[PDB]
Each structure stands twice: as C-alpha cells, then as structure tokens.
Design an enzyme around this catalytic site. Structure first.
Site, PDB file in Angstrom:
ATOM      1  N   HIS A 253      38.589  40.369  44.578  1.00  0.00           N
ATOM      2  CA  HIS A 253      39.344  41.154  43.622  1.00  0.00           C
ATOM      3  C   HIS A 253      38.462  42.257  43.074  1.00  0.00           C
ATOM      4  O   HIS A 253      37.662  42.012  42.178  1.00  0.00           O
ATOM      5  CB  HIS A 253      39.768  40.318  42.416  1.00  0.00           C
ATOM      6  CG  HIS A 253      40.855  39.332  42.684  1.00  0.00           C
ATOM      7  ND1 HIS A 253      41.745  38.972  41.689  1.00  0.00           N
ATOM      8  CD2 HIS A 253      41.177  38.641  43.809  1.00  0.00           C
ATOM      9  CE1 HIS A 253      42.585  38.094  42.217  1.00  0.00           C
ATOM     10  NE2 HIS A 253      42.264  37.866  43.484  1.00  0.00           N
TER      11      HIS A 253
ATOM     12  N   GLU B 147      36.832  45.431  41.097  1.00  0.00           N
ATOM     13  CA  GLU B 147      36.737  45.762  39.669  1.00  0.00           C
ATOM     14  C   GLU B 147      36.088  47.135  39.393  1.00  0.00           C
ATOM     15  O   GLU B 147      35.262  47.653  40.168  1.00  0.00           O
ATOM     16  CB  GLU B 147      36.194  44.602  38.779  1.00  0.00           C
ATOM     17  CG  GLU B 147      36.957  44.385  37.441  1.00  0.00           C
ATOM     18  CD  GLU B 147      36.215  43.537  36.419  1.00  0.00           C
ATOM     19  OE1 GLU B 147      35.437  44.025  35.589  1.00  0.00           O
ATOM     20  OE2 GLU B 147      36.525  42.244  36.477  1.00  0.00           O
TER      21      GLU B 147
ATOM     22  N   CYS C 105      43.491  40.459  48.369  1.00  0.00           N
ATOM     23  CA  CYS C 105      43.713  39.027  48.179  1.00  0.00           C
ATOM     24  C   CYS C 105      44.911  38.500  48.983  1.00  0.00           C
ATOM     25  O   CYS C 105      44.833  38.463  50.205  1.00  0.00           O
ATOM     26  CB  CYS C 105      43.835  38.769  46.649  1.00  0.00           C
ATOM     27  SG  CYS C 105      44.219  37.064  46.142  1.00  0.00           S
TER      28      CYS C 105
END
Ligand SMILES: Nc1ncnc2c1ncn2[C@@H]1O[C@H](COP(=O)(O)OP(=O)(O)O)[C@@H](O)[C@H]1O
Ligand SMILES: Nc1ncnc2c1ncn2[C@@H]1O[C@H](COP(=O)(O)OP(=O)(O)O)[C@@H](O)[C@H]1O
Ligand SMILES: CC[N+](CC)(CC)CC
Ligand SMILES: NCCC[C@H](N)C(=O)O
Ligand SMILES: [Cl-]
Ligand SMILES: [Cl-]
Ligand SMILES: [Cl-]
Ligand SMILES: [Cl-]
Ligand SMILES: [Cl-]
Ligand SMILES: [Cl-]
Ligand SMILES: [K+]
Ligand SMILES: [K+]
Ligand SMILES: [K+]
Ligand SMILES: [K+]
Ligand SMILES: [K+]
Ligand SMILES: [K+]
Ligand SMILES: [Mn+2]
Ligand SMILES: [Mn+2]
Ligand SMILES: [Mn+2]
Lengths: 1059, 375
Positions: B352, B354, B268
């Site tokens: 992002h 996960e 990010c």
C-alpha cells in the site's frame, strides 16, 4: 555491493577511559565492530587506552594498541601497521575528534589510510554546529532561532538576540560537554567561557529556549545503495532542557500520531542524506511542540552512541555490527537479521511488542558542592534499562534495577510534613536525580496530574500512569496483607510492583509476599526479544520477565548451567571492570562447555550483548528477579563475585533461598566484608592492622581517640581524616569506626586466586599516591617501582595466609599499607576487584577466566596456571576524574573514590609507562614552562628535590610564602607569588593568566584544604596540569625524562615478551 | 468488571476486558505489527470481517481523529490489544479510543496476551475466532460461533464494501499545517481517472489527486463498457478486503481494458485481480502481511522499500504468464509484490503506497497516462 577488496587492514579508533557522557557503550560498540570485521576476514587494528575493555582483549583482534589516544601516537601506530582504512565512528567523540585531527595533520594522506563508515566531511558537517544548522535550512527542516559565536562578545550578541534563558552548545562536543542553560548574564559568561575553551573548534551554537517541548530521538542506518531504515524511536520522559543522557527515556515513541511519526521518520532520513552518512548509523534528535506537533531538528551524531546501544538492546538489532559491515561495502539487503536465525535480512524496520525504559544513574552524593540539578550537560554516571509488557511494568522494573536502594516508588518525604508540598514542588519544578520519586510523592500529597505537568512538562500520558500506581499502592496499604488475594496480587504484579515494595506497604517481609506468590502460583513468564513483534521465530534466548500467560524460556534440561550475576548500571566505584570479568566468566565457561546464563540490565555493556552468553535474561539484578530465574533454570552454580557490590549483597539471601552459589561462600564473603569479623581473622592470623575502635558517643571517641592516636580515619557504620582532638569534635559536629591513619605510607593492591589447594598471585600493584588516597583514584604500577622484594614477599605471604583462612574460592584482592618497613592490612575483598582487568592485560593472564574455572571446579594446577607472572615491562595505571563536570567541587584526592575510569601506560621503564599513562589520562602536562609550588608542612622536606628536578628539566619556579622559605634555605630561590589574601598578584591571577604549565599543591587539614581550594579549582578551570600529592609530582617529574610518542607496542607483542 | 473474551477456532481462550461495545464479533483473526496507525488500520476496508490483533501493547495513546479515518467507517470486526492506556495524549485527539469503538459499535477486548496470540497465528497460520464482551461471556458459545464462521477463503468481500453509486473525488493529501485540504475543482485536474472501489482507502485517492487526477469512483462490478464510456485517461483498481478469486465481475472487466491501450494500475486487491485477468493464480497466505515495516525489493532497481502491507492472499509467481514481468518481491518471504504487463500499460503493487509527498509506482502511472494522451 559485497565486501570491499581494496581494503585488507582496518584501524578502529577506541573511545579511551570511561567518563561521564562517554562510557561503556563504546566498548560494546568497539567489540561489535571488531567482531564484525574479523568475521569478514579483515585484518583488525585498534587503539584504546582503556584496559578494562573487552575490545582490547588480544583474542578479539589482530593488532591491539593500549596506548594514549593522541594523534601522534596514533600516527606511530599507522606508520607501524599500515592500515588501509580507518573506522572512526565506534569510539565516541574521542574517535571522531581523533580522526579529524589525523586528517588535519595529513597523517592519513601520508600513509594512504582511507576513512570508512563516515567521511571526514560528513562528520564535520554534523559536528560543526554552524554547518549543521545550514544543512537543515537547506533541507527545509526547522531549528531553534540561534547564533554561532567564536568569542564572548559574539556570544553576548547572540544572547541579546535570543534572550534568556538560552541554550549553549559547543561544536565538536557531546553529552552536553561544555554546554548548559543560561538563565542570566552571569551564568551565560561562565558557560560560554567554558565551552569556547572546550570546543575543539572554539565555537558555540547559542539557541533560544525550547525548554519543555517533547524530546525525541531516532536511530537510523543507511547503506550505499541508499537503502534506509529507522532502527528505533525513542520518546524522552524528561522534556527538552534535560540532556537525553540524563533523562528517563522510552522505546518506542508513545505520543506521536502515525502522521507525526512519518514526518519525523522522513526528516531523520533526509538529515542523514544531507549530512552525507552513506554507510552507517546515526542518531537524529528532535523537539516536538506538544501543542501543535511543530517539529524541530536539534542535532545529529554521525556515529554509534549511548542511544544506539540502548536501541540495539531495546530491539535486538545489533546496530554497530551492521554498521561495521556497511563500512566495508556491504548493503542491508545482503546482511541477515541476527536474532531471527538469519532467516530475514537486516534491511527492515524493527517492531517490538513491549516497552523499554531506561533510567540514568547519578552519583551526586560523591560530589560535595556540586550543582545537582539536571541540565543540558550530562551529569549521570550510568544507566539501567528495563523491558516490560507495559510501560508501568517497564518503569517499575527499571526503578528496582537502579541499584539505588529503591523497590519502586519509595517515598522521599513524609505524609505528615507540613513542608513537604513545598519540597515536592521544588523538586518538580527544578529536576534533580530524584524527581521520579518526588513525582509519586506529589500524587500522595494531593497534587493533580495537571499540577505535576505544569511543573514538569512531563507528558500526562506518563504522569497518569504513576498516579495510578500510587493509588494502587494506597490500596495495598489499606487492605494490607489480608487484602492481597490472587486477583489483586496478580494485578499488582502486572503493573510491575516488586515483592519488596508490596512488603513495605503491607508492613510484612518481602519474603512473605514471595511465599504468597508461591502459594497462588503467581510467577512471571519470559518473553524473547526478536526485533519483529513475534512475526518471525528466533533461535536466540534474549529474555525479559513479565506477568503473562505464555512462557518462552524453554530451558534446556540438557546441560550443566552456570549463572553470572551482572552489576546493573555503572556507578563510580562500580564500573566496566566488573562487567569485563562477568563477560570473561561467561566466555570461559561456555568455551569449557557449560550453558552460560547471564543476568544484567546495563544497556551499555558487552555483558548484555546476546552474543556473550548462551542465555541472557535482561533483568534487574535483585533477589526476586534472580530467584525467579533460578526457579526455572535450576542452574548448577551461580557466580556472585564478579558483578561488584550489587550481586555481592544478594549472596546470603540467595543461598538462604537455596541457590547454588559457587566460589567464595557468602559467609566467607561476610567474614571479609564485616570489619569485626575481619579484625578477628587478622587477630587469628597474627597479622598487623592499624589500631581501631568503635565509638558511639563523642567524648567516647575523643578518649578512645587518645588510645588509637591521631591522625585518624573516621569511617561511620563518606570518610574523613582527623588530626586532632579539636578536629575530632569538629568532625563530630558536621557528622562510627575509628582507625589510626597510616601517614606517609605506600599503598599496595594485590589480586590473587585461591583454589583451596594453592594461591596464585595475579599481581602486586604499587600506588603512586600514598595511603589516604583511594586506591580507585590512585595511579599505580605493576611491577612495583619502589617497594623492596623483601617486603613484597611479606605481602605475598600474608595474601596466602588470608586466602586460606577465609576460604577463598576464586578471585580475591588485598590492600596493604607499608610504613617504616612494616606491612599493614587495610582490607580484603573476597571477590573480583576493579584492578583485575588491568592486571590481566599487563600480565597476559585472564584472571577472570581462570578464577571462573576455579569457581566451577577446575583447579589452578589442572588449568596450568600456577606461577606468578612478572612481565618484562612496566604497566602503569592512571585514572580520569569527573571534576570538570562539577566545577563547584574541589578537585582534590582523598579516601573516597571519585574517578570514573582509567587508562594504561606500557613502558620499558617506569618513567616511560607513567608518561604514557599520564598522556592517556588527558593530562595537559608540558615539558617546559613555570611551575607553581605550594606544599604542606610535611612535604617541605622532599620538595626541595622536586624543585630541583623541575629546575634541571628547564622549568621556572614560583612558590608561596612557606614553601619559598624552605626552598631558600635549601638554596632554591623561586619567584615568590601571593596567596590571594596576601595581595596582588596572587596565584589565581597568575593561573588565570597562563603563567603556569604545572602546579604542585599539597594540603593537610580540613581547614587548610578549604582555604587552598582556589588553587585547585583555577588549575582545573584553566587546564594547567596539577598534582595534589608529592608522590604524584615525583612521578610527573620522572615522566619528563620520557617520550610517550617514541614507541608503541601491541598487546600481542607485550604478551609475547612474557616467558 | 466489564468482561470480554476471545476464543479461537481451535479452542484457545483469551480472557480480558471489554473496552468497546457490548456484544459478540466473529471473524478471521489477524495480527498487525504496526506500532502507530491503529485508527487507520481500523478504518481500512481491507479489514472487513476481520478481527484485528495489535502486537504493540499500548493502543490508543493518541486517541482518534477524523483525519485519521481511511474510510467512512470502521471495517474491523473486532479489536484485540494488550493495554488500553488511561488517557489519550495528543494535540490531534478528538475522542478517546474506547469512546470511539463504542460509537462505531465495535466489540473490543483488552488485557490479554497478544504476544502468545500472535505466535499462535504465526505458527499455525490464521484462525477464525469470536469475541464476546458482556456480563458473562459464554465460552462454549464463543467456540461455537468461532467454528461456525464460513471463512474468508473464497469470500468476495469487495462487493460488500464497494460504494453504491459512482462518484467524484477531487481531494488531495493532508498536511500538518493545512490538515485535510478543500476539494479541488475539475478544471484543476489534468487527468481523469476512474477508480474501481474494491473497498479503497482514502490515502491512495488523495495521492492520485495529488498527482492531477480527477477521479470517478465506481462500484466493484461496474462494466468496462460503462467505464470505457467515460473516456478515462486511466483506470485504477484499488485495495480491498477478502479473496480476489470470486470476483468474476471485475476480472472480466479488467481483461476488457486489457485489449485497450488504456493505462491500468492496481493496488493490493486490484494487484491480484490484474494478475488474475492476466492469467496468473492467487493463493491464500498462511497468516498474511499486516504491518508497516515490510521490506520489499524492486528487482529492477535493486533497492529496498519499507512498506505497509495488509493482505491475506497472494499472487503465485510460479503460475505467472509470460506477459507478466515481476517487478517487486518481499524481502521478508520472497512473495510476489508487483508486476507489469510486458505487452501492455498495466502494472500493480501488492503493498500500500504512501505519500512523502509508491511515488515511483504512482509517478509511472502518470507518465503512463501521459504517454497515452500524448497519443
Ligand atoms: N533550544 C533548546 N532549548 C532547550 N533545550 C534544548 C535546546 N537545544 C537542545 N536542548 C537540550 O540540550 C540537549 C543537548 O543538546 P545536543 O544538541 O543534543 O547536544 P549534545 O551533542 O551534547 O548531546 C538536548 O538533549 C536537549 O535536552
Ligand atoms: N588506616 C588507614 N591508613 C591509611 N590509609 C587508609 C587507612 N584506611 C583506609 N585508608 C585509605 O582509604 C581508602 C579506602 O579504604 P578501604 O577500606 O579500602 O575502603 P573501601 O571499602 O572504599 O575500598 C584506601 O584505599 C586508603 O587510601
Ligand atoms: C569526551 C572524551 N574527551 C573529549 C573527546 C574529553 C575527556 C577526551 C579528550
Ligand atoms: N592519580 C590521580 C590523578 C592525580 C591528579 N593529578 C592529582 O594529583 O590530584
Ligand atoms: Cl565531548
Ligand atoms: Cl510553536
Ligand atoms: Cl481486591
Ligand atoms: Cl574493587
Ligand atoms: Cl557544579
Ligand atoms: Cl490472555
Ligand atoms: K587506502
Ligand atoms: K552533533
Ligand atoms: K530530555
Ligand atoms: K593510594
Ligand atoms: K572495600
Ligand atoms: K488476562
Ligand atoms: Mn551530540
Ligand atoms: Mn545530544
Ligand atoms: Mn579498598
């Protein structure tokens, strides 16, 4: 990868006649699949025995087969069409089942048919319950403790093991067919015996109870590249223990934390990978323990389903379309997202900014004796869906759209009934179709949320919301109309309260609430469905109403609009037939150049496919809702004659409110719909009607009854045939109009169109079963197979006279009864009738498209449709009854309609059409064996012939006492069989033992009926073909002379034979 | 009647109900399309100085719980939703939403047309707004404060959220069964990564741990020199709020590692810094990427990933340096989602990642770190 090229032609397997658990969704899916493939240059071939489908419209595909969905038949189709591939996932379990049989019979091999979308192995892996359960363990996902059983002894052993209650699920069935909840050994043997027998693989999966956990579903799509998405998540309102199809459900899930959601989403995906679904969609079901998030996988359906249709409507993501493309090698990333103006790929997970609610539709009142409690086997006949910005709004709109007369949470019990709390409690503990209403009553009766939870296991998240609605209703009642200030009214409207519910509360007229709303300028806005929470614009106008700030309708000021009112959820008597007409109205007028607006909220239909019209308002079809649309659309015309009873009933009101209703006037509709008005017209026209009387009191009837003459049809202001005075009374006790019953008469339906200038006879259908057996449940033929031309010409003439007199403008239907070479009028339906689709398919004329044009202003002559078409082949229509879903019901025909669907048989002769129709109806009729004959007095004469025809065909005979006497005197000596009371062995025994392959049983008289019930019930339980009418039995006889698998013909071809 | 009101720079007013603290909140207004995960969004530093609008009408159905906190606190300036459910209904909830917002002293508004809002933001791109919850919200005031707001363009937000003093994190992922695990011991983690806390999320960290990484979290500005000094198997540039542009500090540092054969992984904001330090240029998006259904392609493998996005700016693909190979693009808008140095052991991902228990990304990192120690 792009489209496959080693494939040119594809066979799509249709679902067949509509039945409980397997309905319209498949015409929606089937049509989408055609559309999709056809848009990709494939040559499409499909089969579907159900004529009332858009999928079978000749213009939708290359080779259309309306033939019995039997593997042999399909074989003939394969041999004749040489499809490269076969897509078997768009037609319910019929399609799965058939695909696998075909494959098992080596038919696919023999012709080089490749199976796409889903392989046979994957299908089996999911459909074979044992295999499925083995896969989950292989994947480390959890399942209920359970056992597979192939026999009853095995079954009992599993049962000992899991304990009661336990859940029974057969392999290779769906919609809970053949399953149930066993709370005891007795129940256990009954359900097990039934599912073992219904299971295509004679196998059961028996589980321990998870009754009460939360129930969830996920709609998944996966491409060959292994791309994988959740199209939609669904949280059930009703807990585990009530089938998903019989439950109220919502999209999206509401009570899972993101963490639980992800775990569920991961599982879903794994389930598809393990099963082997690589190029399509699938529905994965789970159970969640509300106390600890424990997750359990329940099943998976390797295909499109009622949930995927729901999911598609809910999100605007056309599941089946996409899947049909994956089937042909496309990948998600390669496809564009339909509603976002192709601006984004189909490879993403939808996101919605509203709440979707679906409510099942039941018809328990048509089933006397039926167990009406909700369980694991589906019992619903349809469903409604609604969209709202809030769950509250969502739910209430669904309620009001259910077509059950509710306006929201109308009460079921009285506040002052000392027994209510007790009724409520019951209704809550053991859910029925009415539970939702009882939940509100519980809150009015002072039960708490926790108290309701405990009886229902429905998540509190939901419960609190209903309670809050109740308390708001109560305030409404306190303050009354005077307390209905803008703020408050606005609040109420935001929680989705209907003008009508409010009106009852404030003790005023719905119209008064409506006025108040006008005054205050309190009207809803329209949001659009877009799959992405408004992150991307949409060029589609798929809308829903809500009380908010911004409106997205943006109606065109541009064109002349035409509005089509849908029927809402399907119901018995109100099915797919009406929807088909709606769709046609739309397609025809759009094509003609009008802007077509569709109003409906049935998630399973093509009508509610955004492709079908220019504008779609996914809303309850009620006066309030319609008016708001009209308010802003200012349409040129509104069609209320194509959606069934639903819109039909709104007619006067709409016009009263100034809506531009086109076609047959609402008054005209009334003339026909009101009995009195109606008898006057007949009178006027000098026609023939059976004698009738309106009776108030008993003694009044008995008298009047003497005038009229028995037998009589007792239609109140649920029907019944009374033979005598005693009967009369007899009925009177248990229980008004009175009509002489036309015994031994032929029943005929006639569909016609009137443009005010001329009348078009669409078709004359002769019923096989006589008058007294509802037209909706009778088989029929086009052209008639016994009526004289003379007499048909008489009906033709009466039709014309009536059309003109009543001012019909569009479609109409006439029902006559023929007795002793005399025509009798039974009724007029000044609107599209359920036979329309069949008639169109049989004659090649799209009556609905034609009548729609007429309605819009294009005469029959202008259109070039002025001559009656009498096809060169016979078309037979046969029905499918749901009696097997309700064993407690006596599977007998009568004056009230119970059928859910129908099929069509096309033949060179009546015998041939009938045979195809019968096979198509899932009849277990065999061309050999022993037949049982047990007929009523009146039939005693014609039976001899039947008996003889059966004898010629090589059958053996059995008969009961009286029947035997008659047969003996005629020279036929059947083997005598005992009536149950008579002794042993008796019928039940014999039926039970497989002694029969055919049964003909006729009965006249309430009491004679009640007695014979056992024959009918055993016949059904044991899968023996049975006819309950002499006409029926003759027809069956004729069919023995034919071979439904001998020749197949496409609709294109049929139509091409028409001169 | 606990009023609340949200006003946009543009003068657009939304009147609703107060469901959080009494007060005012100002910031850039964004929309997030996630249907679940509100708590996690709220506690994401990525949201500093932002006013979060959730498209999913019911927010709070499951309450809150610590485990669902992505940072030590609520980073959202404010919260705008359509409906606050009557109750929270989940076995994991420890406190209803309203209560939680109050506790974190957050100014939230409910009962407004979020959809209309969203469309606005989407049509005319982001906007600064002000929320006012209290007795008699002053629209003019709100508009004022709205207009007054500086803006996020050119705002270094990373400095404001970064930790004060470095620290170790040896905590791995949550499990349904285990919940949040106990912290691992140092001898338990093979690798030793140094993470630049540009306002990083607890998930990511647990993830690195999950992969054998013992981490030392450091503040934003820490000097490569200072970093290099710990002999790190690798360096990781976390996610964070605001504009990357003005973070000269980190850029400088980054380049420094870039001379080294040390593996560097950015997520990010860190993905933007790497970019920068690699010569490329960052732009500020019309409305950004906020949600959890965003399709991203791995051009190399031709496979699509459904990801979680929470970014206001992006890295310009036109102005890339040849030492930067494109690894991922957004299927929704073509934007750049990831890159790798043709010349070095450094790459990043915009989204992002996960835990299942992204992985590819993550794993790479490790294999990269191994290759490096295997040297
Ligand atoms: N162990 C179980 N305990 C309680 N109810 C169950 C259990 N397994 C399934 N059910 C219920 O029975 C339903 C039907 O089972 P399912 O496996 O989905 O069959 P079908 O393929 O016929 O839909 C579920 O929707 C659920 O309400
Ligand atoms: N007088 C009658 N004699 C014989 N059969 C009749 C008579 N009246 C009605 N029926 C039977 O009852 C059925 C239903 O009557 P109809 O008026 O058409 O009812 P519905 O409104 O349900 O369509 C018919 O299809 C027919 O079998
Ligand atoms: C569900 C439809 N059937 C099984 C697939 C039963 C009528 C067709 C035979
Ligand atoms: N045409 C309706 C179905 C007929 C059924 N076999 C019966 O005779 O009752
Ligand atoms: Cl089935
Ligand atoms: Cl448990
Ligand atoms: Cl008030
Ligand atoms: Cl009809
Ligand atoms: Cl029953
Ligand atoms: Cl608002
Ligand atoms: K082939
Ligand atoms: K299954
Ligand atoms: K359920
Ligand atoms: K009939
Ligand atoms: K009727
Ligand atoms: K408001
Ligand atoms: Mn199933
Ligand atoms: Mn199921
Ligand atoms: Mn009728």
């Amino acid at each position: 990868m792009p489209k496959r090229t080693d494939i040119k032609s594809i066979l799509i397997l249709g679902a067949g006649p509509i039945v409980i658990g397997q309905a319209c969704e498949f015409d929606y899916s089937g049509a989408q699949a055609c559309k999709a493939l056809r848009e990709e240059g494939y040559r499409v071939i499909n089969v579907n025995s159900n004529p009332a489908t858009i999928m079978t419209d000749p213009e939708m595909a290359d080779a259309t087969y309306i033939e019995p969905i039997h593997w042999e038949v399909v074989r003939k189709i394969i041999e004749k069409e040489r499809p490269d591939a076969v897509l078997p996932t768009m037609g319910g379990q019929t399609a799965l089942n058939c695909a696998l049989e075909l494959e098992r019979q080596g038919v696919l091999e023999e012709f080089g048919v490749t199976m796409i979308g889903a392989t046979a192995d994957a299908i089996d892996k999911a459909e074979d319950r044992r295999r499925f359960d083995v896969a989950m363990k292989k994947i480390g996902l959890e399942t209920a403790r359970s056992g597979i059983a192939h026999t009853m002894e095995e079954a009992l052993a599993v049962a000992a093991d899991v304990g009661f209650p336990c859940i029974i699920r057969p392999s290779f069935t769906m919609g809970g067919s053949g399953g149930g909840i066993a709370y005891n050994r007795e129940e256990f043997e009954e359900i097990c015996a039934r599912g073992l027998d219904l299971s295509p693989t004679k196998e059961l999966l028996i589980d321990e109870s998870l009754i009460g956990w939360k129930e969830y579903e996920m709609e998944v799509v996966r491409d060959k590249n292994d791309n994988c998405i959740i199209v939609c998540s669904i949280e059930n309102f009703d807990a585990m223990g009530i089938h998903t199809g019989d439950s109220i459900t919502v999209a999206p899930a509401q009570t899972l934390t993101d963490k639980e959601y992800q775990i569920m989403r991961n599982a879903s995906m794994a389930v598809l990978r393990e099963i082997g679904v690589e190029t399509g969609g699938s529905n994965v079901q789970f159970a969640v323990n509300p106390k600890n998030g424990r997750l359990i996988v329940i099943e998976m359906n390797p295909r499109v389903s009622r949930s995927s249709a729901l999911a598609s409507k809910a999100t605007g993501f056309p599941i089946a379309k996409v899947a049909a493309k994956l089937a042909v090698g496309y990948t998600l990333d390669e496809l564009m997202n339909d509603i976002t103006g192709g601006r984004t790929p189909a490879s993403f997970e939808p996101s919605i900014d509203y709440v979707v609610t679906k409510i099942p539709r039941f018809n328990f009142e048509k089933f006397a004796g039926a167990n009406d409690r909700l369980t694991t086997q589906m019992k619903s006949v349809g469903e409604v869906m609604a969209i709202g910005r809030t769950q509250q709004e969502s739910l209430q709109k669904a309620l009001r759209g259910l077509e059950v007369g509710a306006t929201g949470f109308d009460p079921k019990v009285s506040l002052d009934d000392p027994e209510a709390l007790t009724k409520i409690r019951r209704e809550l503990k053991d859910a029925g179709a009415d539970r939702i209403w009882y939940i509100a009553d519980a809150f009015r009766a002072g039960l708490s949320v926790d108290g309701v939870f405990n009886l229902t296991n429905i998540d509190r998240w939901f419960l609190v919301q209903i309670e809050e609605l109740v308390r708001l209703e109560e305030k409404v009642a306190e303050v009354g109309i005077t307390g209905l200030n803008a703020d408050f009214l606005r609040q109420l409207k935001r929680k989705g309260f209907a003008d009508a519910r409010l009106a009852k509360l404030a003790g005023v007229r719905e119209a008064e609430i409506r006025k108040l709303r006008d005054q205050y300028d309190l009207h809803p806005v329209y949001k659009r469905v877009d799959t992405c929470a408004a992150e991307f614009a949409t060029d589609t106008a798929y809308m829903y109403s809500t009380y908010e700030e911004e409106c997205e309708a943006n109606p065109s000021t541009d064109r002349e609009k035409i509005m089509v009112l849908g029927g809402g959820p399907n119901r018995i008597g109100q099915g797919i037939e009406f929807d088909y007409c709606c769709v046609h109205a739309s397609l025809a007028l759009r094509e003609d150049g009008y802007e077509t607006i569709m109003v409906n909220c049935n998630p399973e239909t093509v009508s509610t496919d955004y492709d079908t019209s220019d504008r779609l308002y996914f809303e309850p079809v009620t006066l309030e809702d319609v008016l708001e649309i009209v308010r802003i659309e200012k349409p040129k015309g509104v069609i209320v004659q194509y959606g069934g009873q639903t819109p039909l009933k709104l007619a006067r009101a709409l016009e009263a409110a100034g809506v531009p209703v086109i076609g047959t006037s609402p008054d005209a509709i009334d003339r026909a719909e009101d009995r009195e008005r109606f008898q006057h017209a007949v009178e006027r026209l000098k026609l023939k009607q059976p004698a009738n009387a309106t009776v108030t009191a008993i003694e009044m009837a008995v008298e009047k009854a003497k005038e009229i003459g028995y037998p009589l049809v007792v239609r109140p202001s649920a029907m019944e045939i009374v033979y005598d005075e005693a009967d009369l009374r007899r009925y009177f006790q248990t229980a008004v109009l009175l009509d002489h019953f036309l015994d031994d008469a032929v029943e005929v339906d006639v569909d016609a169109i009137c443009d005010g200038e001329m009348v078009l006879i669409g078709g004359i259908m002769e019923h096989i079963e006589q008058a007294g057996v509802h037209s909706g449940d009778s088989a029929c033929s086009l052209p008639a197979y016994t009526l004289s031309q003379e007499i048909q010409d008489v009906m033709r003439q009466q039709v014309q006279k009536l059309a003109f007199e009543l001012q019909v403008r569009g479609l109409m239907n006439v029902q006559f009864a023929v007795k002793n070479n005399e025509v009798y009028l039974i009724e007029v339906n000044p609107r599209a009738a359920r036979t329309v689709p069949f008639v169109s398919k049989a004659t090649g004329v799209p009556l609905a498209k034609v009548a729609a044009r007429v309605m819009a202003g294009k005469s029959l002559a202008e259109q070039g449709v002025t001559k009656e078409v009498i096809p060169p082949y016979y078309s037979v229509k046969e029905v499918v009854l749901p009696f097997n879903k309700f064993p407690g019901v006596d599977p007998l025909l009568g004056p009230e309609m119970r059928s859910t669907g129908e099929v069509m048989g096309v033949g060179r002769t009546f015998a041939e059409a009938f045979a195809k129709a019968q096979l198509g109806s899932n009849s277990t009729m065999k061309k050999h064996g022993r037949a049982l004959l047990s007929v009523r007095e009146g039939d005693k004469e014609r039976v001899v012939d039947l008996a003889a025809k059966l004898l010629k065909q090589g059958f053996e005979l059995d008969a009961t006492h009286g029947t035997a006497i008659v047969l003996g005197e005629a020279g036929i000596n059947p083997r005598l069989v005992n009536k149950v009371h008579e002794g042993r062995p008796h019928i039940q025994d014999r039926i039970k033992n497989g002694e029969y392959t055919y049964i003909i049983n006729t009965t006249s008289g309430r009491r004679a009926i009640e007695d014979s019930r056992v024959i009918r019930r055993s016949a059904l339980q044991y899968k023996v073909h049975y006819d309950t009418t002499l006409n029926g039995g003759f027809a069956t006889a004729m069919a023995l002379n034919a071979d439904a698998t001998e020749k197949v013909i496409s609709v294109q071809e049929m139509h091409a034979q028409i001169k | 009647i606990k009023s609340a009101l949200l006003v946009l720079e543009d003068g657009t007013q939304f009147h609703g109900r107060a469901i959080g603290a009494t007060g005012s909140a100002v910031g850039e207004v964004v929309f997030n399309t996630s249907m679940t995960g509100y708590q996690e969004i709220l506690t994401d530093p990525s949201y500093s100085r932002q006013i979060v609008t959730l498209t999913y009408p019911h927010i709070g159905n499951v309450g809150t719980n610590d485990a669902d906190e992505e940072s030590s606190q609520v980073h959202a300036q404010g919260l705008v939703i359509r409906d606050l459910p009557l109750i929270a209904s989940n076995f994991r909830n420890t406190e209803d939403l309203s209560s939680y917002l109050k506790r974190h002293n957050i100014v939230a508004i409910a009962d407004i047309d979020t959809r209309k809002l969203t469309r606005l933001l989407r049509e005319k791109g982001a906007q600064n707004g002000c929320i006012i919850a209290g007795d008699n919200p002053d629209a003019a005031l709100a508009l004022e404060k709205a207009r007054a707001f500086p803006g996020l363009n050119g705002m270094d937000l990373a400095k404001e959220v970064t930790t004060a003093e470095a620290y170790s994190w040896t905590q791995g992922s949550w499990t349904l069964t285990g919940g949040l695990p106990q912290a691992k011991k140092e001898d338990e983690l093979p690798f030793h990564v140094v993470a630049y806390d540009f306002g990083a999320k607890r998930n990511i960290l647990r993830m690195l741990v999950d992969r054998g990484c013992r981490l030392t979290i450091v503040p934003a500005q820490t000097s490569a020199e200072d970093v290099l000094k710990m002999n790190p198997d690798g360096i990781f540039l976390s996610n964070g709020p605001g504009d990357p542009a003005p973070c000269d500090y980190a850029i400088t540092a980054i380049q420094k590692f870039l001379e080294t054969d040390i593996p560097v992984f950015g997520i990010c904001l860190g993905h933007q810094l790497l970019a920068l330090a690699s010569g490329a240029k960052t732009v500020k998006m019309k409305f950004g990427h906020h949600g959890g259904n965003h399709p991203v392609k791995d051009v190399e493998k031709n496979v699509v990933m459904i990801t979680a996005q929470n970014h206001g700016f992006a890295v310009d693909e036109a102005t890339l340096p040849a030492n930067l190979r494109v690894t991922h693009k957004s299927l929704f808008d073509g934007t750049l989602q990831g890159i790798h140095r043709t010349d070095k052991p450094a790459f990043s991902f915009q989204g992002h990642p996960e835990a299942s228990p992204a992985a590819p990304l993550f794993d790479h990192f490790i294999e990269l770190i191994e290759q490096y120690r295997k040297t």
